[PDB]
């Protein structure tokens, strides 16, 4: 770290045997969904006789 370097956008101190070339970003979100619902019903009889 003799002639102690620093990255161009100075926010680090690289050692003087390395050089940097700055770039990036990347991300990706994704999601899914699934629902359901069911029902039913009834029946009836009746007879009143005589």
């Amino acid at each position: 770290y003799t002639n102690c370097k620093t990255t161009e956008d100075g926010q680090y101190i690289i050692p003087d045997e390395v050089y940097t070339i700055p770039q990036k970003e990347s991300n990706l979100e994704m999601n899914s969904e699934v629902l359901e619902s069911w029902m039913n019903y009834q029946s009836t009889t009746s007879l009143s006789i005589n």
Binding site: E29, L35, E36, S37, W38, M39, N40, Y41, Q42, S43, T44, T45, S46, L47, S48, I49, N50
Partner: protein, 50 residues
Amino acid sequence: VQEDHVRSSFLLDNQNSQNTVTASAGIAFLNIVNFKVETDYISQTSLTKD
């Protein structure tokens, strides 16, 4: 470079059926002055699916 997709899908069903059956009688003046017969019958069916 940013992008996104949304793909909603909403499929709903329904089958709301019904029945109503009724019978009757009432043979009554002769040899039996009175006797009466009647049956009733009602059936339902409601099935939803989403």
